[PDB]
Each structure stands twice: as C-alpha cells, then as structure tokens.
Design an enzyme around this catalytic site. Structure first.
Site, mmCIF file in Angstrom:
data_model
loop_
_atom_site.group_PDB
_atom_site.id
_atom_site.type_symbol
_atom_site.label_atom_id
_atom_site.label_comp_id
_atom_site.label_asym_id
_atom_site.label_seq_id
_atom_site.Cartn_x
_atom_site.Cartn_y
_atom_site.Cartn_z
ATOM 1 C CB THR A 1 2.285 30.256 -18.323
ATOM 2 O OG1 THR A 1 3.573 30.089 -17.703
ATOM 3 C CG2 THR A 1 1.925 28.973 -18.936
ATOM 4 C CB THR A 2 -1.253 33.994 -17.594
ATOM 5 O OG1 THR A 2 -1.106 33.112 -16.474
ATOM 6 C CG2 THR A 2 -2.689 34.492 -17.627
ATOM 7 C CE1 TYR A 21 9.485 17.664 -26.279
ATOM 8 C CE2 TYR A 21 10.844 19.184 -27.560
ATOM 9 C CZ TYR A 21 10.163 17.974 -27.437
ATOM 10 O OH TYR A 21 10.151 17.024 -28.490
ATOM 11 C CE1 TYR A 49 5.505 29.572 -12.946
ATOM 12 C CE2 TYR A 49 5.925 30.659 -14.968
ATOM 13 C CZ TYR A 49 5.095 29.981 -14.179
ATOM 14 O OH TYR A 49 3.891 29.683 -14.727
ATOM 15 N NE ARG A 55 -0.067 24.102 -17.753
ATOM 16 C CZ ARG A 55 -0.552 25.086 -18.513
ATOM 17 N NH1 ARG A 55 0.178 25.605 -19.501
ATOM 18 N NH2 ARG A 55 -1.777 25.573 -18.281
ATOM 19 C CE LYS A 113 3.803 32.382 -11.587
ATOM 20 N NZ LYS A 113 3.568 32.776 -12.973
ATOM 21 C CB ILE A 151 3.142 36.048 -10.301
ATOM 22 C CG1 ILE A 151 4.281 37.047 -9.991
ATOM 23 C CG2 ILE A 151 2.881 36.024 -11.831
ATOM 24 C CD1 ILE A 151 5.697 36.574 -10.365
HETATM 25 MG MG MG Z 1 8.908 33.323 -17.902
#
Ligand code: MG
Ligand code: LYS
Ligand code: LYS
Ligand code: LYS
Ligand code: LYS
Ligand code: MG
Ligand code: MG
Ligand code: MG
Ligand code: MG
Ligand code: MG
Ligand code: MG
Ligand code: MG
Ligand code: NA
Ligand code: NA
Lengths: 297, 306, 306, 297
Positions: free
Chosen positions: B55-56, B119, B145, B150, B174, B215
């Site tokens: 994401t980052t 989504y 994760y 989100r 995560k 992370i």
């Molecule tokens: Mg990923």
C-alpha cells in the site's frame, strides 16, 4: 507524587436475593477476593449493576465493601459515576465520608457531553473530595469518548485525578496516553488485553474475570508489575477463552451466570432490563469454565 | 494430498524490522535510481527486510510491469546483503495475486506479502480459497495482510489460523486493524505463527505480546529508530523498545494525518530524501495545513541522510 | 391472559408534529414560568403534541421530582387545547421507567415516550421484558424510542414488532438511528405501527415512507415550519413537505454541530426565546466557533416570538 | 441543461462458462432486461465482478451491452471505475469510443484518496470524454466517502458529471445533496431504499434486484417518477425481503445464486476470491424467491 490505587482490582458483581441486594453474599464474595491476592475492589460499577440499584442501595454496597476490607490490605475504589454531575458529586462525597480509599467515575452515558463538558464534570468531581479519582472511559456503553488531551488536562489540573481505566479496545490511545503523560496510572478495563496494557506501563486492572478467577488475575497483574512479562503473558493467553466468553452477552450477564454455575452465588437474579442469558450461552459459559481452576470460599 | 498439520513444520519465515517502501516518481515514471538509493539507505540502517509495492508503495496505481520492476530492483539492491525482500503481491483478483506470487518466486524474492482482497468483499470461505491458491502456486513464505479499513473485509482469526495450519508456506499475518484483542486472540490460539505489526504507533505493544516483526511506514524516514526498537523487543529488552516507541509516537501519528502514503512521501520530500513530492492520482499532495504540521513534527527527530 | 394479536386492536395513538421540549434553567433551577411560556408558543404554532423531558429536555440531569414537575406543567399548559402531552418516561432501570409511566398516567399525560435503556446494554430479551413491564403498568399509549448512538443499544425491528403485536398500548417507535433501511423494514413488515421521525433532517423521507409524525428538536425554534411540513406530508402533499424539509436542512444540521440540546438551547438564547444560556453539567455552552456558526445559520430563517 | 441517463437501470451480473465470460448468456440476459421495462444497463460494475475481469474482458462486456441495446430505447451506462485514475480514464475513453451512452465510475477503492484527490480523479475522468459521467459512492466497499461538497463541486465544475449513485445507507446525505444542488441526478444504489431515495427527488436506480425482477424494479421506478408514490412504495415494500436476502453474503454472490436458482444462468460460477454461498444461504435465497413472480426469457 500523587496518591494512587493500583494493582489487581475487581469490578464486583452485586448478588440479589428476592430482588434485594444480598448483603451477606456481597460480603462473602468480597472476602473471597481479599483471600485471593486482589489489591482493591470496586463496588457498584457497570459490573455491579449501578444503573438499576437505587442511590440508597449503591451507598449500602460501598459501605459493605469498606467494612469488609477494613483491617486488610485491600483498598476500596468506590464506583461513583453518573451522567449527572450533581449525582456523581453526591456519590463522590458519600464515598469519601464513608471511608472509601478512592473513587471510580464513569464518563457520562446517554447525554454525550463535549470534551469541555467532560472536563468540567470531572473537575467538579475532583473538587468535591480529597481522595484519588480514577477516570473511566467506555465509549461502547456511554456514547462518548474522553480524549487523551482531556485526560491529560484533568491529570495536570486536578491533584486527585490520577489515571484512567480504559475500556476502549484502543492500544494506540494507551500508547498516546503514557507517552505524553507518563506519570498517570493507566488501568486496564478490558480483561482480554490486560497484559498488553500492563506491558506498556499500565499499573493495574479493573477486572470482570477476577470475580470468578481472582487468583489468576492477581497473579497476572503482579507478574507484569514485577516485569515478569513472560509469566504475565502466559496467564493472559490462558485466560483469553474465559475473558471472551464473559462478554458473549452484555456484562454482567455472563459473569453472574458463571458465578452461579460455580456455586458462588445462590440465584441467577438480575434487575430488569438485565435478565438471564440464552440457554445456549448458559451452556457455552459452563463449558469454557470447565477448563479453569476455580477457587471456592 | 492436503492436510491440516503444517503448524510445526518448517515454515521458512521472514521476520524482524521491515520497511514498506515508498515508490518515488519522476515525471510520472518510477524513479528507479532513487528507488535503489532509498533501499540502500534502509540496508545501511539496520533493516532486516524490505517490502516493495505494498500500500505504501502505491500498488494500486503502478502497472503490473512497474510493480514487477520494483520487485526486481529490490531483489538486486539487496543481493549479497543479509536483507530479505518480502515482495508485495496482493490483489483483489486471485488470478492476479497468483501471477504476482509466481513472478516474485521466479525473480528471487525471499517471500511475499499478500493483502486481503479489497473492494469485492469475499466471504471467509473465499478468502480461504484465495490464499490456498496463492500459497499452492509457490514454495516461498507467504505473509497474510489484514487492513480492513482499506479493503472492506477482514480475515478472521479462525481463517488466519486455518490457513497457517493448512498451507505449508503461510507463516503469519501483518495486522493493520487497531485491534490488540485480535493480536492476543491470534497468538493465544496459534502461538507458532508470526504476527507482524502493520501499525507503527503500536509496534511495541504487538512485539511485547510475542509479535516477531514490523512492516513499517515510519522506517522510510527513521530506519535506524524502527530497527533499534524492533531488535530491542526481540531481545526482550522491553524497557528500551518502549522508550523508542514512545519517542516515535508523534511522528508515527502525523504520518497518518492523511491517507498513507501522502504524509510519508511529504516527510521524505521535506527531509530531502526524494527530489519531488509526486504521487499518481487519485493520490495527491496534502493540504497546506497538514504539510506544515508534518514539517513541524519532524523537527524533533534526527533524520539520517544517504 | 397475554396474547400475540394486538396489532389491529384499538391502539390509541399520538401522532403528528411534536416537539421535544427544551427545559430552561434559571439560577440552576427549572424556570417553570419560561417552560410554560415556551409550551404555549408551541401550541400557538400548529404543534400537535409536546414531549416534556426527553433527551432534548435534559432528562439525565433533572431529578425525578423536577422531571415530574415538567410533566405537570406540560399537562396543565395543554389542558383545554387540542395539543397532547407525550411524556418522556424512559430509564435504563425498568423500575424507574415503570414509576415514570405510572406518574404520567396518574397526572393526565396522554401517552409516554420511553427511550431504550442507556448504559447497561440489555439484550433483546431484556428490552422485550423492559417494555412489557412498562406497557403493562399503564393504560395509555407507549411510543418506543430508539437512539443507539446515545444508548449503546438497538431495539431490533423484530423486537419492536413483537412489542407492537404483544402489548395493547405500544403503538410505534421514534427512530433516531440514521437508518432509512430500518424505516422501510419496520413499515414493510408491520404497516399498522406509527413510525415517528426522531431526526429532523430526515423528517420528510420518514413521513413519505408512511411515518405518521415527528418528535422534533428544530420545532423548539421553528414550530410553524415543522408543523407545516408534517401536516403537508400527512395530507400526501409531498412536494410542499419536501420543499420545507429542504429549506430546513441547514438549521436542522447546525442544531447537531454539538450534542443536542447544546445547539438548540444556544439558538433559543440567540433568538431571545430563553433568558440565559444555562445547562446542567455535564452539558455546557458550545465552543465560540460553533456559537458563531449557529448564529449565522439562523439569519436565513424567520423566527417567531411569543 | 445536462445530458443525463436516469430511470430504472440494472447492474448486470457477468455469467461465466468454464471460467470465461459466457458472451451468449450475457447478451440473452441483457435482452431480458430490455423486454422488461428497464431504461439502461450497467455492464461490469461491482455486480458484474469488475475486480476479477481482465481489462480485455471488461471491454468485451461493454461492447456486448452496446451491441445488444442498439436500436432499442435502452441506454448503456458503462462501468468504468478504478482505484487508479489512469485506468479509469482508459476505461472512460474506451466506453466513449465504443458507443456507450455514459459511464459509471466507482470511488477509488483501497488507496483512500482525500477529497482533493477524489476531485482530481473525477475531473480527469470527466475531461477524458464527452458523454455523461455518474459518480458512485459505496464506502463499505471502497473505504472512502465522496463528500456532498465534493460531489457538488464536481457537478458544477464538470459538464459531464450529472449526479451520483449512492450506496451509503445515508438518507440524510441524500437530503443534503438535493437541497443544495437540486439539478443533480441522485440515483439509488441500494435496492431496499429505492423508494425513499426516489420520493426525495432521486431520478433512478442502479439495481441488483432487477437482474432477477426487472419488471418490478422498472414499475417501481416509473411509478415514483410519475409521482405515484403510493404504488411505488407498495412495490418497494413487497420487494424488501428479496432486496435484503440478496445481500446475505457479499453481492454478487446471492444474485448470481438467485439467477441460477431460476434457470436464468446455466452454472453457479464466480471468479476467485468470490465463490458459492453457504448451503444454508443457498436454501434461504430459494425460499425467499418463491414469494415473487419471476419472468423468464
Ligand atoms: Mg500486498
Ligand atoms: N438509573 C439511574 C440512577 C442510578 C443511581 C444509582 N447508581 C442511572 O443509571 O444513572
Ligand atoms: N489498480 C489495480 C491494478 C494494480 C496492478 C499492480 N499492483 C488494482 O489496484 O488492483
Ligand atoms: N441521571 C439519572 C436519573 C434521571 C432521573 C430523572 N429523569 C439517569 O439519567 O437515569
Ligand atoms: N483487479 C484490478 C483490475 C481490474 C481491471 C478490470 N476492471 C482492480 O480491481 O482494479
Ligand atoms: Mg463508575
Ligand atoms: Mg497445523
Ligand atoms: Mg479464536
Ligand atoms: Mg398482532
Ligand atoms: Mg424517554
Ligand atoms: Mg425484518
Ligand atoms: Mg464503476
Ligand atoms: Na487540590
Ligand atoms: Na466541457
């Protein structure tokens, strides 16, 4: 630099008999807490059905707790919260005059004060007594949240206000609180996460589970305060299943059910609008209890 | 045949202090030179692994080609160092996630991170089948994760644990969920898994409950501090780990004053670590007020250069 | 004996345009003269019923004696007019709620409003037993009131409908829940009940789905407008009802910029309808900024005096 | 003063056969919508599994919808949303060049843009085409919310942007939108509340239920647009049970299940991570369907 009440503490259930407070059972249950390592007891919080006791019954319960703990090392942190400041001040003054060691004071429920209102509410309460005051944040029940800024302002502005019992599932806020005001006493108000709160520098718990398993909750807390995090985490992990099942319906419905299932109270009685659990949850609670070592009287 | 007893079998794990790498852009394109320079800076500041294109790293707006290029740069820059590459490989489409997993394996990544589908809100059964397909497609470690704010979905504790027990390569999760109760639940019922902090402000509470790494977003800016924190905690020096976690709270919080990675790229630009404050739409610059707040918070931290 | 077929039996109902009355204080005490004057102003501006001592009337901080005094003033001021008194009678303790219900009956109220228990989070079974005890204690109409953001609990659609079918006097619910799906659910499965809007901004959508009245905060300030809106809708003049609901959106929204009743008392003070801006702790004055926002929004509305 | 696409519209399911788009089934299903009063169809939104189609398959579905609606009164409002602006612009341009009447464009999922970012995203999309653009707010799936202020700014600043499909359970926002910008087209994106949105001045629906019951959804919408609110509400009330059961698991899992249960698609196939419903919900959907009159081909 402040007077404090910390360590392992129990949010006492209030037993009823024929609809009245069973005052003998109440004293007996407090003695059982005292004999199993508990550092303080909290009469008449949420767990003790503060909403449905009368003001007279609430006061009687504070008196029984003070009387039963006299001459022992165990302190009384009296439940004194209200959604009306004038009622919370009245309870605070009663507790002080009747020998409580400190008070717990829930954030106002139902009327959703602003942060300024929360500040004025708790300042009025702190101004009414000369004993320690612990704030109590439980937004899922009250509909409001005492912000970190408000908590720290109260701690700095009011000698008596020495920390907060957090029941908010928000370990980020727990970090925020102690990183910015490390002098306060953060107290766990959610049993499942007692160990994470203690390992970040929290200094006690106000427990539901300790009604049933006081020795385990006291051992957990004291290990953590002694920086034996391995042994504290071990107990916290072992307790997760009972810690979770005790909220399968709104507290105190499961914990009173568990105390009845273990023979520690004589009847499974609540005051409306609280009532017995479903038969399915009654049976679920019993099966979880069978994995734990439950002390008697 | 498949089986339910993988929990104590060799799960190659990737743990320790890890960085969710930002992806710098120059004139709209990935700045591959800057990307390599930034990864080298992580390596030289105690970081144990890097995560390209999570994401980052703006996984949503990179093309599949650019995503793969970033994985390759990370692998090449870390070659010959102790630092591992846990490649971002997640998707809301299982066929895309399997494709990224296979690419990561074939191009030398040490493992993959794989975000819960965003989504389309799969059921727990669908999440199980999603991650079974991903894990079965490769022979390198897979870290789940969870970030429900989100994705719109949550991988439940029971589903995480089933995947750990049922799949050889899935070794932990995560968590970016603001839910320390779930962190207790996970490790109380399956203590063999690797719980990894995905929320910087609570790195120390997760590690002190037996989590085995982070992370991090903040480590893009302060790699040294995040790695020191993590390594103190892994050594059971909780006093020193908490001290850093507390010192970092202000920067950890301001780095989420707008959606990550808007604040961390802003901070990297302010510190002189990237040349331009460029995003791909729909991400964009912070408000003037938040830009100024980030700049003020940073003045209390000593920022390493290259 | 009790039975499950009350739905088409005589339920005396209280419907139409209703006002959740503010409670004015003077030197900390209930200003009983002002209270009567304010109720008279509601009567003269088309209001069909008044609700003394609900949330808007600071039920939490009045004593039980003051709560009863306010009910008495409302009954006396409405005597001899067509305007009914739906007395606030709710509590988180069933014994207190039964006591208030009996008081309302014995002192001439036309019915009661009864908020779902706050703070102690009863189960649906407990809510059923709570409201059964209240309904069985009197022979006047009982309107349930759901406001989960304040109470921490929700009376489910199934529980509301069971109470309507199982209890002679329970005739509907005041919903303050931001949930138009539930409003559809309620009236699609039990169209005989009276759904009452408890959220001013959405008065028209609730009425246009077959709701039969409002219990309003805004009507403290703009009684004429809220009553006209409600009466247009009840006459199936939806065009004219929507026109007022749209015109009122700005004031309806600003009256919740801080917890009700902080904004409505502020507005009543700004308009000259109460002499002092006094609350009982833990309620207090709004911020200076919100005071100014309320004052600016009000300039677009024509405020009736006495 | 703007070009618009309104009325009763269907968020088309995408049938699969052996893992590929069943292009013949897709056309047949669209013809069934056309013959049952529908005003527009929406290929490849959330309901059509936009997340797991390839960009090539997405485009094929838009083409089939355009081709099947040619020479009929029914418009194609092509699904064109993305969490990447460059992908959303590419889909928008494709739709325009391939004869769609307008586009639907979901708010970016996963990456949580700010309001400024949402404004720039949709402005870029509107600048890329000369056909109508309908915004689509569904915060439960995307993790972000397009604010009323942002929606109105886009409507005023971008000729093509003519309204928003709201799937947010927020009738207050529906009032806010049309009270401050009454020229926009508010479109219901939540079937259970189609009638409340229409009766406040909304001008259409983009429906899941209409896949199964197109005649009922079209009748409801057209009654409301003709100000026959009594008859529109009657249908909305009758439809509540199916409208609710179609979200017992994440859409489109229940609606594809229902289409299979009625013999309208040949296999109950999804693309991972979507999958069949539980056997209990499969049976629940079937029992609700038995209360409705389902048109065939
Ligand atoms: Mg990923
Ligand atoms: N039921 C009222 C009064 C309780 C008084 C004794 N604690 C309340 O919950 O505030
Ligand atoms: N924008 C698409 C494709 C990204 C492909 C590279 N990570 C998504 O977010 O799923
Ligand atoms: N403060 C208590 C008592 C109010 C009594 C008068 N309404 C409560 O909110 O329940
Ligand atoms: N899986 C990616 C790409 C889908 C492309 C076709 N709609 C996403 O959901 O954004
Ligand atoms: Mg208290
Ligand atoms: Mg195993
Ligand atoms: Mg579990
Ligand atoms: Mg009936
Ligand atoms: Mg009430
Ligand atoms: Mg129902
Ligand atoms: Mg779309
Ligand atoms: Na003092
Ligand atoms: Na133009």
């Amino acid at each position: 630099d402040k007077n404090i009440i910390i360590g392992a503490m129990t949010a006492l259930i209030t037993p009823f008999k024929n609809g009245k407070v069973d005052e003998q059972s109440y004293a007996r249950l407090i003695k059982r807490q005292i004999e199993n390592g508990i550092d303080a007891v909290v009469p008449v919080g949420t767990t003790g059905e503060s909403a449905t006791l009368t003001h007279e019954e609430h006061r009687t319960c504070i008196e029984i707790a003070v009387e039963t703990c006299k001459g022992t090392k165990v302190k009384v942190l009296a439940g004194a919260g209200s959604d009306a400041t004038h009622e919370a001040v009245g309870l605070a003054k009663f507790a002080k005059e009747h020998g409580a060691d400190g008070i717990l004071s829930v954030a106002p429920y139902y009327n959703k004060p602003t942060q300024q209102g929360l500040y004025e509410h708790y300042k009025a309460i702190a101004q009414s007594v000369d004993i320690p005051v612990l704030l109590y944040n439980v937004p899922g029940r009250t509909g409001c949240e005492i912000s970190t800024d408000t908590i720290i302002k109260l701690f700095r502005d009011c000698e008596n206000i020495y920390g907060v019992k957090e029941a908010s599932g928000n370990i980020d806020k727990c970090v925020d609180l102690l990183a910015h005001e490390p002098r306060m006493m953060l107290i766990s108000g959610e049993d499942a996460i007692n160990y994470p709160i203690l390992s970040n520098g929290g200094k006690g718990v106000i427990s539901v589970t300790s009604n049933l398993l006081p020795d385990m909750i006291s051992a957990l807390t004291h290990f953590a305060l002694d920086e034996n995090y391995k042994e504290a985490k071990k107990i916290n992990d072992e307790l997760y299943n009972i810690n979770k099942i005790l909220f399968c319906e709104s507290n105190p419905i499961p914990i009173k059910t568990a105390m009845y299932l273990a023979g520690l109270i004589e009847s499974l009685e609540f005051r409306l609008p609280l009532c017995s659990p479903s038969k399915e949850n009654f049976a679920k609670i019993e099966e979880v209890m069978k994995k734990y070592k439950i002390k008697g009287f």
